[PDB]
């Protein structure tokens, strides 16, 4: 209905600093630095005072205003990634065959290697993205922990690792094998 302007608000806490040239966003704070490109979304940012920044879309339709809430939702995840950081813990439940999971470094690329999934001889390598560090859980049986600064580096690298172990041509009510995501929590 051609809204004259809408706005949302980004709440900047005390630790982080945000540098925004035209649509290039950099978030620097305690745990690290991040970037995210936004040349496609066509919005306007405005600083008022050092903790609050208002996004804006002038004279836009319904599609152009629905894409303004999601720009708040991306920069806020760029904020909590630098203050608190992300940490996904995964459990990999097997039925009969003990699943051997390791971390190997071929050519400096640091893959995740899965062996013996449902008795298969096939070796699967899942590549590790930049800035996600995988550690095996201490003193908790059968758990793998993914953690990094970015949502979309961590949540993709945990989603990749469970699609690599999908059971084919069998009944999923009977065969229990696979790797799954326990819960999506913060570091601190």
């Amino acid at each position: 209905m051609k809204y004259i302007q809408t706005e949302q608000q980004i709440e900047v806490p005390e630790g982080v600093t945000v540098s925004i040239k035209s649509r290039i966003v950099k978030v620097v704070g305690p745990r690290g630095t991040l970037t995210k490109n936004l040349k496609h979304i066509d919005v306007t940012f405005t600083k008022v005072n050092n903790q609050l920044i208002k996004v804006a879309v002038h004279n836009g339709g319904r599609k152009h205003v629905a894409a303004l809430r999601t720009v708040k939702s991306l920069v806020d995840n760029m904020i909590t990634g630098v203050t608190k950081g992300y940490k996904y813990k995964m459990r990999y439940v097997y039925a009969h065959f003990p699943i051997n999971v390791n971390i190997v470094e071929k050519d400096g690329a640091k893959f995740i290697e899965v062996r013996n999934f449902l008795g298969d001889k096939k070796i699967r390598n899942v590549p590790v993205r930049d800035g996600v560090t995988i550690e095996f859980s201490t003193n908790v049986k059968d758990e793998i922990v993914l953690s990094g600064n970015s949502v979309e580096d961590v949540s993709q690298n945990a989603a990749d690792l469970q699609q690599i172990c999908r059971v084919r041509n069998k009944d999923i009510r009977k065969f229990l094998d696979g790797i799954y995501v326990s819960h999506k929590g913060f570091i601190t």
Binding site: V93, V140, K141, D142, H183
Partner: protein, 227 residues
């Protein structure tokens, strides 16, 4: 288009509306000249037989509950509009879930009763460790030889909502490491209270507190502080 499709049902019960509000607007103004005592009571968490105890124990009392702003509408929130006088100060106090009481027995008996009246409800205190074996629906309270193993339907509820790690060998439910859910002297989390809810541990006592009194013939606001 592209609107939210609301869930439509077929249940028996229907919504009330405004006409139940205006009745409580009338019943509060009717109870002022009828009864002699106005007792306002802050009681946030309740249990229904706790409330059905207090109603049937006192025939002379009328325990009238409702929304807060309806009670401000009926008692009169501003000093300019009120049914009976000297009433706008005590209606300022009812900030929580409050239900008015209209008795005519005594001002000493009512203030003595609620310190003598105490019950036990959920914690929402003492600490509990779970053994690293078969979990039971009592949870180490009674001896486990007489206990019942937990139903496996709420075991996905335990692994996801209660955050407790349970992997299942056979018809019973097993954990492998001992797990403590609470510690003493700590404010309990809502995930910690629901563990004690499914275990059926209502070991924290409940008492209802009262904050103020009014007397119609004297027409003055009385504030009494008991917890």
């Amino acid at each position: 288009r592209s609107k939210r499709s609301k869930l439509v049902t077929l249940a028996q019960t229907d919504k009330k509306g405004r006409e139940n509000k205006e009745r409580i607007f009338d019943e509060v103004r009717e109870a002022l000249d009828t009864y002699r005592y106005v007792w306002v009571l802050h009681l946030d968490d309740v249990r229904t037989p706790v409330l059905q105890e207090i109603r049937t124990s006192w025939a002379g009392s009328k325990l009238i509950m409702g929304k807060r702003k309806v009670l401000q509408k009926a008692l009169g929130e501003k000093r300019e509009e009120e049914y009976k006088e000297n009433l706008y100060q005590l209606s300022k106090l009812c900030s929580g879930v409050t239900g008015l009481l209209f008795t005519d027995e005594d001002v000493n008996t009512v203030k003595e009763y609620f310190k003598s009246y105490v019950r036990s409800d959920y914690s929402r205190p003492l600490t509990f460790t779970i053994p690293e074996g078969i979990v039971y629906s009592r949870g180490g309270q009674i001896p486990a030889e007489e206990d019942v193993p937990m139903i496996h339907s709420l075991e996905p509820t335990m692994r996801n909502k209660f955050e407790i790690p349970t992997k299942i060998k056979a018809g019973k439910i097993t954990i492998d490491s001992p797990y403590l859910v609470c510690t003493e002297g700590e404010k309990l989390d809502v995930r910690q209270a629901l563990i004690l809810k499914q275990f059926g541990i209502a070991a924290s006592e409940f008492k209802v507190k009262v904050s103020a009194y009014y007397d119609n013939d004297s027409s003055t606001v009385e504030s009494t502080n008991i917890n």
